[PDB]
């Protein structure tokens, strides 16, 4: 259905695009 897809997509990519930008940092320590 509509809306839900946008919502699940809102959490998608972003959660990683932002986490990758952070994970890439913690990767120096870990």
Question: What residues contact 2, with CB distance under 8 A and at least 6 apart?
Answer: none
Cα 13 to Cα 21: distance, rounded to the nearest angstrom: 12
Give the chain's end-to-end CA distance (angstroms, integer): 40
Tokens 């998608």 found at: 12
Experimental approach taken? NMR
- DSSP classification of residue 1: -
Structure tokens at 30: 């870990």
Cα 30 to Cα 12: distance, rounded to the nearest angstrom: 24
Cα 4 to Cα 7: distance, rounded to the nearest angstrom: 5
Structure tokens at 6: 């946008």
**Count of Cβ atoms closer than 10 Å to residue 22 Cβ:** 9
The H or E element containing residue 28 is: helix 14-29
Burial-class residue 27 by CB neighbours within 10 Å (0-12, 13-18, 19+): exposed
- DSSP classification of residue 30: -
């Amino acid at each position: 259905x509509h809306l839900l897809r946008e919502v699940l997509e809102l959490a998608r990519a972003e959660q990683l695009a932002q986490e990758a930008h952070k994970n890439r940092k913690l990767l120096e320590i870990i």
